[PDB]
Symmetry: C2
Subunit: 62 residues, 2 copies
Amino acid sequence: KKKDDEIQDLKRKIEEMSAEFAKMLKDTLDKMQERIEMVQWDSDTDPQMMKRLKDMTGLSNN
Amino acid sequence: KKKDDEIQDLKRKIEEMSAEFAKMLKDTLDKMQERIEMVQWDSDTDPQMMKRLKDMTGLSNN
């Protein structure tokens, strides 16, 4: 019973670490997008380059 | 003994996930730094913005 409980706890904490992995990955992607967009907007570069970055980043929502 | 083996496998998975998390977080940080530096160099803005972007994140080499 002790070892079963330990295995369950290990699985649960593996799931928790994976969840934090994914959540902070999404947060990092969001911050990357925000900084990139703000730099693009503050720069006088063309909306053509705006669309170029938008396409290259692969962020086109389906 | 089977339970001990399962526990050890779970611990190894935990360590592998932690290593992957740290490595790929470093990779994402490097990607963001490279993109910021490239977008900063392409623009003809005064190195004032270079220094401002360097100082804002507090990532000054320690």
